Amino acid sequence: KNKCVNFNFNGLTGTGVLTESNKKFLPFQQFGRDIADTTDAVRDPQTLE
Amino acid sequence: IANQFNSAIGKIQDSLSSTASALGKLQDVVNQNAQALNTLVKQLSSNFG
Ligand SMILES: *[C@@H]1O[C@H](CO)[C@@H](O[C@@H]2O[C@H](CO)[C@@H](O[C@H]3O[C@H](CO)[C@@H](O)[C@H](O)[C@@H]3O)[C@H](O)[C@H]2NC(C)=O)[C@H](O)[C@H]1NC(C)=O
Ligand SMILES: *[C@@H]1O[C@H](CO)[C@@H](O)[C@H](O)[C@H]1NC(C)=O
């Protein structure tokens, strides 16, 4: 977290800095998206955060 | 002439404090800037086939 990183989650490859979010996802949602249709929040598959 | 001028400047304070419609010539420039940028971000969603 807080470093720039080549992330992949579930085939969502991208680049960015990860941070602990306060978004209240529901159990069925894996990704949240920007106005630009680009992912900008993700639920890690190892640990549900 | 001074009382007419002082009273007339007094109406500029009240007019600008009151009517929502006044600075429309400036707010429509800020709105055209913002709408063109939101449209340009939104065009990142488009598939183009
Ligand atoms: C030229 O136009 C002037 C208006 O822009 C006008 O001034 C106004 O004169 C009236 C009296 O004639 C004043 O009315 C008030 O008079 C007393 C209080 O002072 C009260 O008895 C009245 O009920 C009323 O409140 C206006 O206040 C006054 N306005 C200004 C800006 O001075 C002139 O009289 C006109 N001059 C000529 C030669 O016609
Ligand atoms: C991943 O492993 C942790 C224990 O290390 C476990 O709590 C978690 O439920 C596992 N995730 C999945 C999706 O099985």
mmCIF file with all atom_site columns, all heavy atoms in Angstrom, chain B residues 29-48:
data_model
loop_
_atom_site.group_PDB
_atom_site.id
_atom_site.type_symbol
_atom_site.label_atom_id
_atom_site.label_alt_id
_atom_site.label_comp_id
_atom_site.label_asym_id
_atom_site.label_entity_id
_atom_site.label_seq_id
_atom_site.pdbx_PDB_ins_code
_atom_site.Cartn_x
_atom_site.Cartn_y
_atom_site.Cartn_z
_atom_site.occupancy
_atom_site.B_iso_or_equiv
_atom_site.pdbx_formal_charge
_atom_site.auth_seq_id
_atom_site.auth_comp_id
_atom_site.auth_asym_id
_atom_site.auth_atom_id
_atom_site.pdbx_PDB_model_num
ATOM 1   N N   . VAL B 1 29 ? -19.697 30.223 -19.212 1.00 0.00 ? 29 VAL B N   1
ATOM 2   C CA  . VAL B 1 29 ? -18.313 29.966 -19.648 1.00 0.00 ? 29 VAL B CA  1
ATOM 3   C C   . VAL B 1 29 ? -17.669 28.895 -18.787 1.00 0.00 ? 29 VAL B C   1
ATOM 4   O O   . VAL B 1 29 ? -17.057 27.957 -19.295 1.00 0.00 ? 29 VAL B O   1
ATOM 5   C CB  . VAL B 1 29 ? -17.470 31.247 -19.620 1.00 0.00 ? 29 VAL B CB  1
ATOM 6   C CG1 . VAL B 1 29 ? -15.992 30.996 -19.921 1.00 0.00 ? 29 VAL B CG1 1
ATOM 7   C CG2 . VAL B 1 29 ? -17.989 32.227 -20.667 1.00 0.00 ? 29 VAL B CG2 1
ATOM 8   N N   . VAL B 1 30 ? -17.860 28.979 -17.471 1.00 0.00 ? 30 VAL B N   1
ATOM 9   C CA  . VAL B 1 30 ? -17.413 27.951 -16.526 1.00 0.00 ? 30 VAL B CA  1
ATOM 10  C C   . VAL B 1 30 ? -18.120 26.629 -16.801 1.00 0.00 ? 30 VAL B C   1
ATOM 11  O O   . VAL B 1 30 ? -17.491 25.576 -16.791 1.00 0.00 ? 30 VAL B O   1
ATOM 12  C CB  . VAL B 1 30 ? -17.655 28.420 -15.086 1.00 0.00 ? 30 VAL B CB  1
ATOM 13  C CG1 . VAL B 1 30 ? -17.293 27.353 -14.053 1.00 0.00 ? 30 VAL B CG1 1
ATOM 14  C CG2 . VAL B 1 30 ? -16.808 29.656 -14.781 1.00 0.00 ? 30 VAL B CG2 1
ATOM 15  N N   . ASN B 1 31 ? -19.409 26.664 -17.122 1.00 0.00 ? 31 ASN B N   1
ATOM 16  C CA  . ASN B 1 31 ? -20.172 25.469 -17.454 1.00 0.00 ? 31 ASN B CA  1
ATOM 17  C C   . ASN B 1 31 ? -19.744 24.867 -18.793 1.00 0.00 ? 31 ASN B C   1
ATOM 18  O O   . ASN B 1 31 ? -19.610 23.652 -18.870 1.00 0.00 ? 31 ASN B O   1
ATOM 19  C CB  . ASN B 1 31 ? -21.673 25.772 -17.445 1.00 0.00 ? 31 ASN B CB  1
ATOM 20  C CG  . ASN B 1 31 ? -22.228 26.145 -16.084 1.00 0.00 ? 31 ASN B CG  1
ATOM 21  O OD1 . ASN B 1 31 ? -21.569 26.107 -15.054 1.00 0.00 ? 31 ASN B OD1 1
ATOM 22  N ND2 . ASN B 1 31 ? -23.489 26.493 -16.034 1.00 0.00 ? 31 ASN B ND2 1
ATOM 23  N N   . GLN B 1 32 ? -19.478 25.660 -19.834 1.00 0.00 ? 32 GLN B N   1
ATOM 24  C CA  . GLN B 1 32 ? -18.948 25.114 -21.085 1.00 0.00 ? 32 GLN B CA  1
ATOM 25  C C   . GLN B 1 32 ? -17.558 24.498 -20.908 1.00 0.00 ? 32 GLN B C   1
ATOM 26  O O   . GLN B 1 32 ? -17.295 23.436 -21.468 1.00 0.00 ? 32 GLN B O   1
ATOM 27  C CB  . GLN B 1 32 ? -18.906 26.191 -22.167 1.00 0.00 ? 32 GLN B CB  1
ATOM 28  C CG  . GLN B 1 32 ? -20.286 26.427 -22.788 1.00 0.00 ? 32 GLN B CG  1
ATOM 29  C CD  . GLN B 1 32 ? -20.295 27.581 -23.791 1.00 0.00 ? 32 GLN B CD  1
ATOM 30  O OE1 . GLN B 1 32 ? -19.284 28.177 -24.147 1.00 0.00 ? 32 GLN B OE1 1
ATOM 31  N NE2 . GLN B 1 32 ? -21.445 27.933 -24.322 1.00 0.00 ? 32 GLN B NE2 1
ATOM 32  N N   . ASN B 1 33 ? -16.674 25.093 -20.103 1.00 0.00 ? 33 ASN B N   1
ATOM 33  C CA  . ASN B 1 33 ? -15.398 24.455 -19.775 1.00 0.00 ? 33 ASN B CA  1
ATOM 34  C C   . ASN B 1 33 ? -15.609 23.105 -19.084 1.00 0.00 ? 33 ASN B C   1
ATOM 35  O O   . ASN B 1 33 ? -15.019 22.109 -19.498 1.00 0.00 ? 33 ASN B O   1
ATOM 36  C CB  . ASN B 1 33 ? -14.552 25.374 -18.877 1.00 0.00 ? 33 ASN B CB  1
ATOM 37  C CG  . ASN B 1 33 ? -13.975 26.614 -19.530 1.00 0.00 ? 33 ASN B CG  1
ATOM 38  O OD1 . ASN B 1 33 ? -13.295 27.397 -18.877 1.00 0.00 ? 33 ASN B OD1 1
ATOM 39  N ND2 . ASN B 1 33 ? -14.165 26.815 -20.813 1.00 0.00 ? 33 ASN B ND2 1
ATOM 40  N N   . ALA B 1 34 ? -16.448 23.060 -18.050 1.00 0.00 ? 34 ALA B N   1
ATOM 41  C CA  . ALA B 1 34 ? -16.689 21.850 -17.278 1.00 0.00 ? 34 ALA B CA  1
ATOM 42  C C   . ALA B 1 34 ? -17.397 20.759 -18.093 1.00 0.00 ? 34 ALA B C   1
ATOM 43  O O   . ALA B 1 34 ? -17.048 19.587 -17.981 1.00 0.00 ? 34 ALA B O   1
ATOM 44  C CB  . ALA B 1 34 ? -17.497 22.234 -16.036 1.00 0.00 ? 34 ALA B CB  1
ATOM 45  N N   . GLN B 1 35 ? -18.361 21.117 -18.938 1.00 0.00 ? 35 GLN B N   1
ATOM 46  C CA  . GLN B 1 35 ? -19.082 20.151 -19.759 1.00 0.00 ? 35 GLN B CA  1
ATOM 47  C C   . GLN B 1 35 ? -18.199 19.545 -20.846 1.00 0.00 ? 35 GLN B C   1
ATOM 48  O O   . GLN B 1 35 ? -18.259 18.339 -21.074 1.00 0.00 ? 35 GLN B O   1
ATOM 49  C CB  . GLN B 1 35 ? -20.315 20.817 -20.368 1.00 0.00 ? 35 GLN B CB  1
ATOM 50  C CG  . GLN B 1 35 ? -21.170 19.810 -21.143 1.00 0.00 ? 35 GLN B CG  1
ATOM 51  C CD  . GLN B 1 35 ? -22.545 20.370 -21.474 1.00 0.00 ? 35 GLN B CD  1
ATOM 52  O OE1 . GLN B 1 35 ? -22.698 21.485 -21.957 1.00 0.00 ? 35 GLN B OE1 1
ATOM 53  N NE2 . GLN B 1 35 ? -23.597 19.623 -21.238 1.00 0.00 ? 35 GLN B NE2 1
ATOM 54  N N   . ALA B 1 36 ? -17.347 20.345 -21.488 1.00 0.00 ? 36 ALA B N   1
ATOM 55  C CA  . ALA B 1 36 ? -16.406 19.835 -22.472 1.00 0.00 ? 36 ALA B CA  1
ATOM 56  C C   . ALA B 1 36 ? -15.403 18.866 -21.835 1.00 0.00 ? 36 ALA B C   1
ATOM 57  O O   . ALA B 1 36 ? -15.146 17.805 -22.395 1.00 0.00 ? 36 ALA B O   1
ATOM 58  C CB  . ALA B 1 36 ? -15.715 21.014 -23.154 1.00 0.00 ? 36 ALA B CB  1
ATOM 59  N N   . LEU B 1 37 ? -14.892 19.153 -20.636 1.00 0.00 ? 37 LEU B N   1
ATOM 60  C CA  . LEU B 1 37 ? -14.030 18.205 -19.932 1.00 0.00 ? 37 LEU B CA  1
ATOM 61  C C   . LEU B 1 37 ? -14.768 16.945 -19.486 1.00 0.00 ? 37 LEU B C   1
ATOM 62  O O   . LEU B 1 37 ? -14.249 15.852 -19.689 1.00 0.00 ? 37 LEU B O   1
ATOM 63  C CB  . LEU B 1 37 ? -13.351 18.879 -18.741 1.00 0.00 ? 37 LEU B CB  1
ATOM 64  C CG  . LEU B 1 37 ? -12.224 19.825 -19.159 1.00 0.00 ? 37 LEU B CG  1
ATOM 65  C CD1 . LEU B 1 37 ? -11.767 20.639 -17.955 1.00 0.00 ? 37 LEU B CD1 1
ATOM 66  C CD2 . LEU B 1 37 ? -11.020 19.052 -19.674 1.00 0.00 ? 37 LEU B CD2 1
ATOM 67  N N   . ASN B 1 38 ? -15.969 17.039 -18.919 1.00 0.00 ? 38 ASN B N   1
ATOM 68  C CA  . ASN B 1 38 ? -16.722 15.843 -18.551 1.00 0.00 ? 38 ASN B CA  1
ATOM 69  C C   . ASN B 1 38 ? -17.085 15.002 -19.769 1.00 0.00 ? 38 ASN B C   1
ATOM 70  O O   . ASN B 1 38 ? -17.022 13.778 -19.694 1.00 0.00 ? 38 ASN B O   1
ATOM 71  C CB  . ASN B 1 38 ? -17.967 16.217 -17.739 1.00 0.00 ? 38 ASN B CB  1
ATOM 72  C CG  . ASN B 1 38 ? -17.642 16.499 -16.285 1.00 0.00 ? 38 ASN B CG  1
ATOM 73  O OD1 . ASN B 1 38 ? -16.616 16.094 -15.752 1.00 0.00 ? 38 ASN B OD1 1
ATOM 74  N ND2 . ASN B 1 38 ? -18.518 17.178 -15.584 1.00 0.00 ? 38 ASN B ND2 1
ATOM 75  N N   . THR B 1 39 ? -17.391 15.613 -20.909 1.00 0.00 ? 39 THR B N   1
ATOM 76  C CA  . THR B 1 39 ? -17.638 14.867 -22.146 1.00 0.00 ? 39 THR B CA  1
ATOM 77  C C   . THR B 1 39 ? -16.381 14.164 -22.628 1.00 0.00 ? 39 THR B C   1
ATOM 78  O O   . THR B 1 39 ? -16.435 12.995 -23.000 1.00 0.00 ? 39 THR B O   1
ATOM 79  C CB  . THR B 1 39 ? -18.178 15.773 -23.245 1.00 0.00 ? 39 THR B CB  1
ATOM 80  O OG1 . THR B 1 39 ? -19.318 16.453 -22.775 1.00 0.00 ? 39 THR B OG1 1
ATOM 81  C CG2 . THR B 1 39 ? -18.610 14.972 -24.467 1.00 0.00 ? 39 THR B CG2 1
ATOM 82  N N   . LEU B 1 40 ? -15.228 14.823 -22.547 1.00 0.00 ? 40 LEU B N   1
ATOM 83  C CA  . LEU B 1 40 ? -13.960 14.229 -22.940 1.00 0.00 ? 40 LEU B CA  1
ATOM 84  C C   . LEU B 1 40 ? -13.534 13.080 -22.016 1.00 0.00 ? 40 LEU B C   1
ATOM 85  O O   . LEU B 1 40 ? -13.034 12.072 -22.506 1.00 0.00 ? 40 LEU B O   1
ATOM 86  C CB  . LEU B 1 40 ? -12.924 15.351 -23.019 1.00 0.00 ? 40 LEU B CB  1
ATOM 87  C CG  . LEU B 1 40 ? -11.556 14.898 -23.525 1.00 0.00 ? 40 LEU B CG  1
ATOM 88  C CD1 . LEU B 1 40 ? -11.613 14.443 -24.979 1.00 0.00 ? 40 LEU B CD1 1
ATOM 89  C CD2 . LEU B 1 40 ? -10.571 16.051 -23.421 1.00 0.00 ? 40 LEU B CD2 1
ATOM 90  N N   . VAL B 1 41 ? -13.760 13.159 -20.703 1.00 0.00 ? 41 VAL B N   1
ATOM 91  C CA  . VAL B 1 41 ? -13.563 12.002 -19.820 1.00 0.00 ? 41 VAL B CA  1
ATOM 92  C C   . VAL B 1 41 ? -14.556 10.899 -20.139 1.00 0.00 ? 41 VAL B C   1
ATOM 93  O O   . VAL B 1 41 ? -14.171 9.738  -20.217 1.00 0.00 ? 41 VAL B O   1
ATOM 94  C CB  . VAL B 1 41 ? -13.666 12.371 -18.337 1.00 0.00 ? 41 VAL B CB  1
ATOM 95  C CG1 . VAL B 1 41 ? -13.581 11.151 -17.412 1.00 0.00 ? 41 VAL B CG1 1
ATOM 96  C CG2 . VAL B 1 41 ? -12.511 13.279 -17.938 1.00 0.00 ? 41 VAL B CG2 1
ATOM 97  N N   . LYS B 1 42 ? -15.827 11.221 -20.363 1.00 0.00 ? 42 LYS B N   1
ATOM 98  C CA  . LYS B 1 42 ? -16.853 10.224 -20.660 1.00 0.00 ? 42 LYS B CA  1
ATOM 99  C C   . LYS B 1 42 ? -16.559 9.454  -21.941 1.00 0.00 ? 42 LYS B C   1
ATOM 100 O O   . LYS B 1 42 ? -16.783 8.248  -21.965 1.00 0.00 ? 42 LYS B O   1
ATOM 101 C CB  . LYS B 1 42 ? -18.206 10.930 -20.699 1.00 0.00 ? 42 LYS B CB  1
ATOM 102 C CG  . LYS B 1 42 ? -19.362 9.940  -20.857 1.00 0.00 ? 42 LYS B CG  1
ATOM 103 C CD  . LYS B 1 42 ? -20.730 10.633 -20.781 1.00 0.00 ? 42 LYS B CD  1
ATOM 104 C CE  . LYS B 1 42 ? -21.011 11.363 -19.454 1.00 0.00 ? 42 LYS B CE  1
ATOM 105 N NZ  . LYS B 1 42 ? -21.006 10.448 -18.274 1.00 0.00 ? 42 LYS B NZ  1
ATOM 106 N N   . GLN B 1 43 ? -15.970 10.073 -22.959 1.00 0.00 ? 43 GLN B N   1
ATOM 107 C CA  . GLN B 1 43 ? -15.541 9.387  -24.180 1.00 0.00 ? 43 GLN B CA  1
ATOM 108 C C   . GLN B 1 43 ? -14.447 8.327  -23.969 1.00 0.00 ? 43 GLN B C   1
ATOM 109 O O   . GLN B 1 43 ? -14.169 7.549  -24.876 1.00 0.00 ? 43 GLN B O   1
ATOM 110 C CB  . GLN B 1 43 ? -15.111 10.422 -25.228 1.00 0.00 ? 43 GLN B CB  1
ATOM 111 C CG  . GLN B 1 43 ? -16.296 11.115 -25.911 1.00 0.00 ? 43 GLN B CG  1
ATOM 112 C CD  . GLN B 1 43 ? -16.999 10.241 -26.944 1.00 0.00 ? 43 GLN B CD  1
ATOM 113 O OE1 . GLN B 1 43 ? -16.972 9.020  -26.925 1.00 0.00 ? 43 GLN B OE1 1
ATOM 114 N NE2 . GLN B 1 43 ? -17.685 10.812 -27.902 1.00 0.00 ? 43 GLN B NE2 1
ATOM 115 N N   . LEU B 1 44 ? -13.855 8.198  -22.781 1.00 0.00 ? 44 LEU B N   1
ATOM 116 C CA  . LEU B 1 44 ? -13.009 7.050  -22.451 1.00 0.00 ? 44 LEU B CA  1
ATOM 117 C C   . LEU B 1 44 ? -13.810 5.755  -22.251 1.00 0.00 ? 44 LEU B C   1
ATOM 118 O O   . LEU B 1 44 ? -13.251 4.672  -22.380 1.00 0.00 ? 44 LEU B O   1
ATOM 119 C CB  . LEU B 1 44 ? -12.169 7.370  -21.212 1.00 0.00 ? 44 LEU B CB  1
ATOM 120 C CG  . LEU B 1 44 ? -11.205 8.543  -21.421 1.00 0.00 ? 44 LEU B CG  1
ATOM 121 C CD1 . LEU B 1 44 ? -10.580 8.947  -20.094 1.00 0.00 ? 44 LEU B CD1 1
ATOM 122 C CD2 . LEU B 1 44 ? -10.081 8.161  -22.374 1.00 0.00 ? 44 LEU B CD2 1
ATOM 123 N N   . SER B 1 45 ? -15.112 5.849  -21.985 1.00 0.00 ? 45 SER B N   1
ATOM 124 C CA  . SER B 1 45 ? -16.020 4.709  -21.812 1.00 0.00 ? 45 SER B CA  1
ATOM 125 C C   . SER B 1 45 ? -16.379 4.029  -23.123 1.00 0.00 ? 45 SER B C   1
ATOM 126 O O   . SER B 1 45 ? -16.799 2.876  -23.136 1.00 0.00 ? 45 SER B O   1
ATOM 127 C CB  . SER B 1 45 ? -17.348 5.174  -21.215 1.00 0.00 ? 45 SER B CB  1
ATOM 128 O OG  . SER B 1 45 ? -17.154 6.164  -20.232 1.00 0.00 ? 45 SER B OG  1
ATOM 129 N N   . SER B 1 46 ? -16.285 4.756  -24.229 1.00 0.00 ? 46 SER B N   1
ATOM 130 C CA  . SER B 1 46 ? -16.766 4.344  -25.542 1.00 0.00 ? 46 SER B CA  1
ATOM 131 C C   . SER B 1 46 ? -15.931 3.201  -26.113 1.00 0.00 ? 46 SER B C   1
ATOM 132 O O   . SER B 1 46 ? -14.706 3.208  -26.029 1.00 0.00 ? 46 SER B O   1
ATOM 133 C CB  . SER B 1 46 ? -16.718 5.551  -26.472 1.00 0.00 ? 46 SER B CB  1
ATOM 134 O OG  . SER B 1 46 ? -17.402 6.622  -25.852 1.00 0.00 ? 46 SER B OG  1
ATOM 135 N N   . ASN B 1 47 ? -16.575 2.201  -26.709 1.00 0.00 ? 47 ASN B N   1
ATOM 136 C CA  . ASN B 1 47 ? -15.880 1.041  -27.259 1.00 0.00 ? 47 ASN B CA  1
ATOM 137 C C   . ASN B 1 47 ? -15.247 1.303  -28.622 1.00 0.00 ? 47 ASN B C   1
ATOM 138 O O   . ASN B 1 47 ? -14.284 0.632  -28.968 1.00 0.00 ? 47 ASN B O   1
ATOM 139 C CB  . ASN B 1 47 ? -16.865 -0.124 -27.407 1.00 0.00 ? 47 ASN B CB  1
ATOM 140 C CG  . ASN B 1 47 ? -17.319 -0.742 -26.105 1.00 0.00 ? 47 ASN B CG  1
ATOM 141 O OD1 . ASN B 1 47 ? -16.758 -0.551 -25.039 1.00 0.00 ? 47 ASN B OD1 1
ATOM 142 N ND2 . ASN B 1 47 ? -18.359 -1.537 -26.160 1.00 0.00 ? 47 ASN B ND2 1
ATOM 143 N N   . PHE B 1 48 ? -15.829 2.166  -29.455 1.00 0.00 ? 48 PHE B N   1
ATOM 144 C CA  . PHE B 1 48 ? -15.439 2.337  -30.859 1.00 0.00 ? 48 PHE B CA  1
ATOM 145 C C   . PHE B 1 48 ? -15.359 1.017  -31.653 1.00 0.00 ? 48 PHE B C   1
ATOM 146 O O   . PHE B 1 48 ? -14.602 0.887  -32.615 1.00 0.00 ? 48 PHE B O   1
ATOM 147 C CB  . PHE B 1 48 ? -14.170 3.190  -30.941 1.00 0.00 ? 48 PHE B CB  1
ATOM 148 C CG  . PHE B 1 48 ? -14.281 4.508  -30.206 1.00 0.00 ? 48 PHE B CG  1
ATOM 149 C CD1 . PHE B 1 48 ? -13.475 4.780  -29.090 1.00 0.00 ? 48 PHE B CD1 1
ATOM 150 C CD2 . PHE B 1 48 ? -15.202 5.471  -30.646 1.00 0.00 ? 48 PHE B CD2 1
ATOM 151 C CE1 . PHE B 1 48 ? -13.572 6.016  -28.435 1.00 0.00 ? 48 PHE B CE1 1
ATOM 152 C CE2 . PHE B 1 48 ? -15.322 6.691  -29.968 1.00 0.00 ? 48 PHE B CE2 1
ATOM 153 C CZ  . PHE B 1 48 ? -14.494 6.973  -28.876 1.00 0.00 ? 48 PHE B CZ  1
#
